[PDB]
């Protein structure tokens, strides 16, 4: 029904391509790869899976395979090459609404294309990821976080409705008003309940430009307090985007230059500052203001802060250029063969009450005396902008920090041990963190991740929507 039409491929090249991911650490060969030309092909697969006794195959939905640890694999199963849904010229897979208040996007579509289509209509999504070559379905199955999330919530907080094909092979439109149980489960649901074939994304009138600043600190307490100041509810302050980064002394000059923000002259000034203060760690707030008026607005905001005088660094760019900033980093690194390497990334949400402790143990502790390659990102988020009824798991405090330690790799074994050590420190310190973008490998770890109540709901939704436990087996929750 599909294979004869050429859609279900079992050839070595197809299986190999769906057997690795961005993490470049784990691999798992599928039995087959589906290249669907339309959503009907997905309905056909999932309906067959549902109706066939002794159905053999788990099913994963490969967005662009940006997973770190095999989350998009179907070991001895079927990987869906989602990108195939966007092959045809017509009909379009991205539709900005007639009134420009939302954009409908295929689950397979990448956010960079969503941006381009939105900007053509003078609008843009309000909540992003740092890196735009990720699918709508993929980020929504996790959360989708960046510097706008403090004020707009993650991408899962900016979805009006979705089309989902469940594990029963039923096409279902869901929202807060209709099939809300599926809507809530799928968002941050780690691909466990069905495939998002369409998501309705909130947009706002597109800003033309961004005033883009980096502020330098040697004092973590001042750094974090200022981040919390900028992201505090008043309604929010003027900043459109707030992130931060950590720079360890040993690789200070290198890591500062690797941001792509600081000139060599800028780097020298910061190194000299760190030197005079004998600082083992340097911190930088990264913030934007979307828009002489900008000058005074910026000056007013900066006047509330306590960064080191002389260490505010400014850029002014087109909005789209800011949003796609990391693409240029990829192009450059890929030329030097430094993009397609093992990525033992550590991502977590750390409660505000323990962020200073984390800094002491990790940034001032474990990571000291190493050559770090890749950004160490740290910034506060507001729990109020997250829907706890959705599958995504966050710490219990009103404010928690996104902590993204994006190590690029004999280096691999060292970094894997280092990440275990960081987690060990957190566990022993009693820090109630939640992992993000990580898969756990036993029941107890997953139950702890979700917490008792949310786990029980997660299981209830699994029984309802994927009773055979076929979907996204690489998450290792029910597989
Ligand atoms: C590669 C990477 C990832 C990344 C990032 C930068 C880079 C270079 N920056 C991020 C950021 O700033 N903020 C954020 O929240 N995430 C960021 N990421 C991580 C990224 O979100 C994840 O990798 C995510 O998985 C999206 O990647 P992708 O779209 O390629 O999805 P996948 O890896 O193939 O699949 C992940 C899981 O989701 C399920 N899935 C995929 N599509 C669907 C649909 N349409 N419906 C239901 N489930 C889906 C897969 O089965 C898999 O389990
Ligand atoms: C974008 O809008 C178009 C309507 O112009 C949608 O295209 C239709 O899609 C359905 C089912 O997918 C087909 O039966 C119709 O033949 C299509 N109509 C036209 C005019 O081509 C398209 O599905 C929309 N895309 C998304 C992701 O919502
Ligand atoms: C994975 C996540 C963020 C990644 N952010 C990045 N931000 C800036 N540059 C990069 N290069 C690779 N990843 C990045 C989630 O917080
Ligand atoms: C990682 O990438 C390299 C290419 O640099 C490849 O040879 C290797 O098989 C990959 N490993 C995994 C597990 O993806
Ligand atoms: C799923 O399978 C059941 C039989 O177990 C059947 O009654 C139902 O119609 C099926 N749904 C679809 C859409 O295949
Ligand atoms: C920073 O690292 C360099 C070696 O790269 C070292 O010479 C210097 O003492 C370090 N500074 C501090 C204050 O730790």
Curated annotation (Swiss-Prot):
Positions bound to FAD: 61, 63-65, 67, 71, 130, 135, 141, 145, 196, 436, 472, 475
Residue ranges of coiled coil: none
PTM notes: Glycosylated; with approximately 10 hexose residues per site.
Reactions catalysed according to its record: N(6)-dimethylallyladenine + A + H2O = 3-methyl-2-butenal + adenine + AH2
Cofactor: FAD
Residues linked to a glycan: 13, 24, 50, 95, 249, 278, 382
Keyword set includes Metal-binding: no
Protein name (Swiss-Prot/TrEMBL): Cytokinin dehydrogenase 1
Lineage summary: Eukaryota, Viridiplantae, Streptophyta, Embryophyta, Tracheophyta
């Amino acid at each position: 029904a599909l294979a004869l039409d050429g859609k279900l491929r079992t050839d070595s090249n197809a299986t190999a391509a769906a057997s690795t991911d961005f993490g470049n650490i784990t691999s798992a060969l599928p039995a087959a790869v589906l290249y669907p030309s339309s959503t009907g092909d997905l309905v056909a697969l999932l309906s067959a899976a549902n109706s066939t006794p002794g159905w053999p195959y788990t099913i994963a939905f490969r967005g662009r395979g940006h997973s770190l640890m095999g989350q998009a694999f179907a070991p001895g199963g079927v990987v869906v090459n989602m990108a195939s849904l966007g092959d045809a010229a017509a009909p379009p897979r991205i539709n900005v609404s007639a009134d420009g208040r939302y954009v409908d996007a295929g689950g397979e579509q990448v956010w960079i294309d969503v941006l381009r289509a939105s900007l053509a209509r003078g609008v843009a999504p309000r909540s992003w990821t740092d890196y735009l070559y990720l699918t709508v379905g993929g980020t929504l199955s996790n959360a989708g976080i960046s510097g706008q999330a403090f004020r707009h919530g993650p991408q899962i907080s900016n979805v009006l409705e979705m089309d989902v094909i469940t594990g029963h092979g039923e096409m279902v439109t869901c929202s807060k008003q209709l099939n809300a149980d599926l809507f809530d489960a799928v968002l941050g649901g780690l691909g466990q309940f069905g495939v998002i074939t369409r998501a309705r994304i909130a947009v706002e009138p597109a800003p033309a430009r961004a005033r883009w600043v980096r502020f330098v600190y040697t004092d973590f307490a001042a750094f974090s307090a200022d981040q919390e100041r900028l992201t505090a509810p008043r309604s929010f302050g003027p900043m459109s985007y707030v992130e931060g980064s950590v720079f360890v002394n040993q690789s200070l000059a290198t890591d500062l230059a690797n941001t792509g923000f600081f000139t060599d002259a800028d780097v020298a000034r910061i190194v000299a500052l760190a030197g005079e203060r004998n600082a083992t760690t340097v911190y930088s707030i990264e913030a934007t203001l979307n828009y002489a008026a900008v000058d005074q607005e910026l000056a007013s905001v900066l006047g509330t802060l306590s960064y080191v005088e002389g260490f505010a660094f400014q850029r002014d760019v087109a909005y789209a250029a800011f949003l796609d900033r990391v693409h240029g980093e990829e192009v450059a690194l890929n030329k030097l063969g430094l993009w397609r390497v093992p990525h033992p990334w550590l991502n977590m949400f750390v409660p505000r009450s323990r962020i200073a402790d984390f800094d002491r143990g990790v940034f001032k502790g474990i990571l000291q005396g190493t050559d770090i390659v890749g950004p160490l990102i740290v910034y506060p988020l507001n729990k109020s902008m997250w829907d706890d009824g959705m599958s995504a798991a966050t710490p219990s405090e009103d404010v928690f920090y996104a902590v993204s330690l994006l190590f690029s790799s004999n280096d691999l074994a060292r970094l894997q041990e280092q990440n275990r050590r960081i987690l060990r420190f957190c566990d022993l310190a009693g820090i109630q963190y939640k992992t993000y973008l990580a898969r756990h490998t036993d029941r107890s770890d997953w139950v702890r991740h979700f917490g008792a109540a949310k786990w029980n709901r997660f299981v209830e939704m699994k029984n309802k929507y994927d009773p055979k436990r076929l979907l996204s087996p690489g998450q290792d929750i029910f597989n």
